[PDB]
Structure 1
Amino acid sequence: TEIERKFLVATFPDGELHAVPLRQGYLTTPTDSIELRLRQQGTEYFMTLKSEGGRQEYEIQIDVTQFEMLWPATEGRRVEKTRYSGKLPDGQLFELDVFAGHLSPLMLVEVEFLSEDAAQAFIPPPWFGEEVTEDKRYKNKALALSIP
């Protein structure tokens, strides 16, 4: 399991960034028997089925037409954002999300660490905002289920 900390973003960074637009959305609500999620990852499209009272995750790749026909059934349970991949001066990789639609102006930065004490030793750079690693509200599903 990866080790990571997540922060608000105080200032968008300069430097080398790779941008990927992302759109992801739930067809189901958390109390359903299964979780069915649609995602677009750049140029490819997937539908994922998970069941915890199922074995146990299924993923099918779908085409753009299948995706856009079903997308409207995700309304109100969606996260759309552009994700920027970069690297801090010390070499830690980061992923910086700039959220679209009603989640604007949220921006989040997530950092991955190789030792789970490089993680505890981490000194955030000044462009990072407040840490939200523990805040339940900033988890992906929480963000998708929040409302305008």
Structure 2
Amino acid sequence: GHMVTEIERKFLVATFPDGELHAVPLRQGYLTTPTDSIELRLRQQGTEYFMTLKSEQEYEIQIDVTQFEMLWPATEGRRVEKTRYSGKLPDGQLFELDVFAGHLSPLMLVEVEFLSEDAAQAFIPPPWFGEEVTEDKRYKNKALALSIPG
């Protein structure tokens, strides 16, 4: 049957790449902590703003900038801010490259999407990619948000 869940691998970045990149600044943060009965997340994607509620079912409301900045401070300590660059490798695989801000600096991650779950296994990373972290729990989004400075 057709693709249900995307197939991807994620790496550190040894060298920021050259080439055509499209930049989007991103700020996202959790109002809740993982033991809460629900997950409530705020995100800014460019110039649009959302609050998401999940219970384990998913609600998303678009909010304006003033609603977002009034509530943002209640995400302190559980946030990820980064600029995301979208690009394409020479063979055509699309990538997203995150350059993290605040205490997660100097982290940079690159995530690659594959059309076949065997092109994924055949992938040869280009030299600018660092070590693979696909399986490392610490580099998942929520782990990154919940980590702490110092």
Alpha-carbon separation, structure 2, partners of 1:117 and 1:135: 21
Post-superposition CA distance 1:89-122 (Å, at most 9, x none): 0000000000000000000000000000000000
SS across alignment from 1:120: helix
| Matched pairs, number | 145
**Structure-2 residue corresponding to 1:133:** 134
SS across alignment from 1:144: helix
Name structure 1 gaps, 5 residues minimum.
none
Cα distance, 1:27 vs structure 2: 0.0
Q: Which runs of 4+ in 1 moved over 4 A?
A: none
User: What is the TM-score normalised by the length of structure 1?
Assistant: 0.98
Give yes or no for the alignment of 1:83 onto 2:87: no
Name structure 2 gaps, 5 residues minimum.
none
User: What is the TM-score normalised by the length of structure 2?
Assistant: 0.97
Alpha-carbon separation, structure 2, partners of 1:43 and 1:14: 26
SS across alignment from 1:80: strand
Alpha-carbon separation, structure 2, partners of 1:122 and 1:73: 41
State the percentage of identical aligned residues.
Answer: 100
Post-superposition CA distance 1:110-142 (Å, at most 9, x none): 000000000000000000000000000000000
Cα distance, 1:86 vs structure 2: 0.0
Cα distance, 1:85 vs structure 2: 0.1
